[PDB]
Design a protein around this motif. Structure first.
Motif, mmCIF file in Angstrom:
data_model
loop_
_atom_site.group_PDB
_atom_site.id
_atom_site.type_symbol
_atom_site.label_atom_id
_atom_site.label_comp_id
_atom_site.label_asym_id
_atom_site.label_seq_id
_atom_site.Cartn_x
_atom_site.Cartn_y
_atom_site.Cartn_z
ATOM 1 N N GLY A 144 5.126 41.142 -15.386
ATOM 2 C CA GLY A 144 6.145 40.696 -14.167
ATOM 3 C C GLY A 144 5.236 40.755 -12.582
ATOM 4 O O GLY A 144 6.005 40.792 -11.786
ATOM 5 N N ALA A 145 4.111 41.393 -12.755
ATOM 6 C CA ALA A 145 3.578 41.652 -11.402
ATOM 7 C C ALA A 145 2.704 40.198 -10.769
ATOM 8 O O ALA A 145 2.436 40.719 -9.849
ATOM 9 C CB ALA A 145 2.469 42.821 -11.474
ATOM 10 N N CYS A 146 2.783 39.216 -11.492
ATOM 11 C CA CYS A 146 2.252 38.143 -11.129
ATOM 12 C C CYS A 146 2.672 37.555 -9.955
ATOM 13 O O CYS A 146 4.216 37.465 -9.847
ATOM 14 C CB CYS A 146 1.867 37.204 -12.066
ATOM 15 N N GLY A 147 2.042 37.083 -8.779
ATOM 16 C CA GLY A 147 2.733 36.437 -7.675
ATOM 17 C C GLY A 147 3.638 37.376 -7.133
ATOM 18 O O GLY A 147 4.462 36.909 -6.439
ATOM 19 N N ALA A 148 3.401 38.530 -6.830
ATOM 20 C CA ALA A 148 4.016 39.647 -5.919
ATOM 21 C C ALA A 148 4.040 39.060 -4.593
ATOM 22 O O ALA A 148 5.123 38.984 -3.736
ATOM 23 C CB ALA A 148 3.394 41.057 -6.059
ATOM 24 N N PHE A 149 2.596 38.735 -4.120
ATOM 25 C CA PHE A 149 2.348 38.416 -2.657
ATOM 26 C C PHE A 149 2.949 36.849 -2.506
ATOM 27 O O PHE A 149 3.270 36.404 -1.336
ATOM 28 C CB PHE A 149 0.980 38.547 -2.122
ATOM 29 N N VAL A 150 2.697 36.249 -3.446
ATOM 30 C CA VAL A 150 3.448 34.847 -3.435
ATOM 31 C C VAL A 150 5.102 34.892 -3.092
ATOM 32 O O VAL A 150 5.520 34.074 -2.469
ATOM 33 C CB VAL A 150 3.528 33.895 -4.806
ATOM 34 N N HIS A 151 5.653 35.811 -3.880
ATOM 35 C CA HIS A 151 7.168 35.926 -3.528
ATOM 36 C C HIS A 151 7.126 36.777 -2.134
ATOM 37 O O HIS A 151 8.389 35.979 -1.578
ATOM 38 C CB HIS A 151 7.868 36.876 -4.869
ATOM 39 N N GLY A 152 6.497 37.544 -1.666
ATOM 40 C CA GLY A 152 6.629 38.133 -0.338
ATOM 41 C C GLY A 152 6.510 37.113 0.569
ATOM 42 O O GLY A 152 7.299 37.090 1.614
ATOM 43 N N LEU A 153 5.538 36.153 0.625
ATOM 44 C CA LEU A 153 5.143 35.317 1.556
ATOM 45 C C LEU A 153 6.226 33.946 1.417
ATOM 46 O O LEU A 153 6.677 33.474 2.678
ATOM 47 C CB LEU A 153 4.045 34.719 1.555
ATOM 48 N N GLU A 154 6.675 33.775 0.316
ATOM 49 C CA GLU A 154 7.820 32.733 0.348
ATOM 50 C C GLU A 154 9.258 33.512 0.319
ATOM 51 O O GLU A 154 10.250 32.663 0.470
ATOM 52 C CB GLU A 154 7.851 32.187 -1.095
ATOM 53 N N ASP A 155 9.366 34.601 0.691
ATOM 54 C CA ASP A 155 10.672 35.481 0.904
ATOM 55 C C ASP A 155 11.554 34.516 2.086
ATOM 56 O O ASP A 155 10.967 34.529 3.089
ATOM 57 C CB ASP A 155 10.541 36.969 1.283
ATOM 58 N N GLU A 156 12.809 34.916 1.974
ATOM 59 C CA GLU A 156 13.699 34.233 3.098
ATOM 60 C C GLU A 156 13.783 35.036 4.214
ATOM 61 O O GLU A 156 14.084 34.249 5.367
ATOM 62 C CB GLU A 156 14.909 33.893 2.303
ATOM 63 N N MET A 157 13.422 36.210 4.327
ATOM 64 C CA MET A 157 13.483 36.887 5.454
ATOM 65 C C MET A 157 12.254 36.908 6.337
ATOM 66 O O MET A 157 11.143 37.423 5.418
ATOM 67 C CB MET A 157 14.090 38.432 5.193
ATOM 68 N N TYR A 158 12.216 36.711 7.543
ATOM 69 C CA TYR A 158 10.684 36.852 8.128
ATOM 70 C C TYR A 158 10.174 38.108 8.374
ATOM 71 O O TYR A 158 9.114 38.380 8.536
ATOM 72 C CB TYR A 158 10.831 36.171 9.584
#
Lengths: 122, 110
Positions: B2-16
């Motif tokens: 489940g560690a795949c795309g950690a930074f992908v999720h972070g950069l796509e996160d809804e909070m700036y």
């Protein structure tokens, strides 16, 4: 003294011809133009080798630029013609290209060649 | 895992705030590793399309900070020049700071 802050009376003209040599497309007319450019540049190499070596970083940068393009467009665009022309020119500038002043641009050209070899080893 | 795309999720996160923190993490890691920087250029380019202005500014500043080793391609160059068109003066200044340090391969890029 070849690296001095001096202007040759013929440098701009060999710059024109080396631009004509490097810049080519799939056109056979442009390939004929590039072949004539290689001819004139080679005659200048055998006749006046020192003048061309002052323009070595230029063609080195062009070789750096052209290396990324994949094999199929590389073969179709006739970029292999340009690569073999510059390789032959470097061969015909044999005993002088190995100097210290020309060392950096020579390494740049060789880097472009080996990058080409690695990318299209298939 | 489940560690795949950690930074992908972070950069796509809804909070700036999360995205800015992810940008800082990308900056530090890229300053550590150049290969990771080369891998993550594209995501920074996406952040240059980010809707929040501050996120764009900070991503551009980090890209400037890590430009010393990477070298762009035509896609990256046209995307970068696209956001430079934008109206806000400060982000244009940030693009100007970026281009001062950015590398380039082809003369056509210049």
């Amino acid at each position: 003294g070849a690296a001095s802050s001096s202007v040759c009376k013929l440098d701009g003209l060999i710059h024109r011809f080396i631009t004509l040599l490097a810049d080519t497309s799939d056109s056979r007319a442009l390939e004929n133009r590039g072949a004539d450019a290689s001819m004139a540049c080679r005659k200048l190499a055998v006749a006046h080798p020192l003048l061309l070596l002052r323009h070595l970083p230029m063609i080195a940068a062009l070789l750096h630029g052209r290396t990324h393009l994949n094999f199929q467009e590389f073969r179709q665009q006739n970029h292999l013609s340009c690569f073999l022309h510059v390789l032959g020119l470097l061969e015909l500038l044999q005993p002088h290209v190995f100097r210290s002043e020309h060392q950096g641009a020579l390494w740049d050209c060789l880097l472009s060649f080996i990058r080409l070899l690695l990318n299209y080893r298939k | 895992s489940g560690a795949c795309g950690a930074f992908v999720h972070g950069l796509e996160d809804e909070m700036y705030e999360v995205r800015i923190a992810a940008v800082e993490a990308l900056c530090m890691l890229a300053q550590s590793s150049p290969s990771f920087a080369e891998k993550c250029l594209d995501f920074l380019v996406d952040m240059f399309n980010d809707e929040i202005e501050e996120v764009r500014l900070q991503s551009i500043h980090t890209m400037r900070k890590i430009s010393n080793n990477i070298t762009l391609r035509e896609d990256q160059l046209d995307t970068v020049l696209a956001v430079l068109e934008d109206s806000s003066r400060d982000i244009r200044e940030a693009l100007h700071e970026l281009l001062c340090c950015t590398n380039v391969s082809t003369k056509e890029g210049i």
